[PDB]
């Protein structure tokens, strides 16, 4: 059920309004590679999102 972790985390990345396509691709690919890093990657995405608000 590693893909359920991917799916949940990926939708949370999709929810972020301020990432460009390059950045979305970066985080999604990292999630795709290793779902156990989701909590960390989301934190990183949210921080980057907010800095680009």
């Amino acid at each position, epitope marked *: 059920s*590693y*893909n359920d972790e*991917k799916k949940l985390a990926s939708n949370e990345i999709a929810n972020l309004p301020n990432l460009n*396509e390059e950045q*979305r691709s970066a985080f999604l*690919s990292s999630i*795709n590679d290793d779902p156990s890093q989701s909590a960390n990657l989301l934190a990183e995405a949210k921080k980057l999102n907010d800095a680009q608000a």
Partner: antibody, heavy 120, light 107 residues
Framework: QVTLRESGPALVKPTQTLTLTCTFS??????????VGWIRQPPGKALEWLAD???????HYNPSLKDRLTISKDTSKNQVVLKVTNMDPADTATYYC????????????WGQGTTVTVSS | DIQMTQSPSTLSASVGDRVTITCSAS?????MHWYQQKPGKAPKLLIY???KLASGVPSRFSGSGSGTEFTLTISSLQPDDFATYYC?????????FGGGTKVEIKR
């Protein structure tokens, strides 16, 4: 809207390698989170997932295919190619390609399928 | 890997009947999806994320479940519901399908 179309030989000999091509429209495989997968269905049997490829070039293969599979993409041309080595009459089937997304993990649009027969 | 058994494998019901197909998985998945396949056609997404209706799918269709036990329901069987239905899990690789349930119409 999204459409996919499989193409390849209708007939291949035992031991030969099969090359199938999926050509699609309505979406791009360079889009973040996008994927194409391949599924087959022997006459009168259930569907069996074979492989998938992701926009980031990540690939997965079904162990049931015993390392016989190679998948690749040409994002430029909206094509995904699947190769299957050492074909056997047990591989006679209709072969489908279909779109997946990392937000979904389900195939939401499929091609019409292309029928392959393995015979001398 | 994760495998699924559907029951029944063959089903015969009259028009207007309510029909239920079950899918039991060998281990817990977060979602079950369902495909409908008509004779000579590719599978078509029917239910996704366990209970969500795919586009162009009548309210007649519904899905339920959680853990290892999922069901697809058709609330008023119509002639055009003649098909084989497959459950599908994308929660773990390899992706897998149930063995299918052929739905026949009594008349």
């Amino acid at each position: 809207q999204v459409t996919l179309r499989e193409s390849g030989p209708a007939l291949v000999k035992p031991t030969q390698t099969l090359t199938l091509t999926c050509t699609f429209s309505g979406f791009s495989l360079s889009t973040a989170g996008m994927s194409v997968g391949w599924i087959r269905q022997p006459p009168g049997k259930a569907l069996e997932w074979l492989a998938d490829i992701w926009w980031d070039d990540k690939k997965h293969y079904n162990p049931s295919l015993k390392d016989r599979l190679t998948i690749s993409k040409d994002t430029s041309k909206n094509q995904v190619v699947l190769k299957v080595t050492n074909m056997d009459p047990a591989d006679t089937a209709t072969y489908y390609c279909a779109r997946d997304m990392i937000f979904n993990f389900y195939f939401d649009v499929w091609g019409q399928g292309t029928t392959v027969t393995v015979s001398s | 890997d994760i495998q699924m058994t559907q029951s029944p494998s063959t089903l015969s019901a009259s028009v207007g009947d309510r029909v239920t197909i079950t899918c039991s998985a060998s281990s817990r998945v977060g979602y079950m999806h369902w495909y409908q396949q008509k004779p000579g056609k590719a599978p078509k997404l029917l239910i996704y994320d366990t209970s969500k209706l795919a586009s162009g799918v009548p309210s007649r269709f519904s899905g339920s479940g959680s853990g290892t036990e999922f069901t697809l329901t058709i609330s008023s069987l119509q002639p055009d519901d003649f098909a084989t239905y497959y459950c599908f899990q994308g929660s773990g690789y390899p992706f897998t399908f149930g063995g299918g349930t052929k739905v026949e119409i009594k008349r």
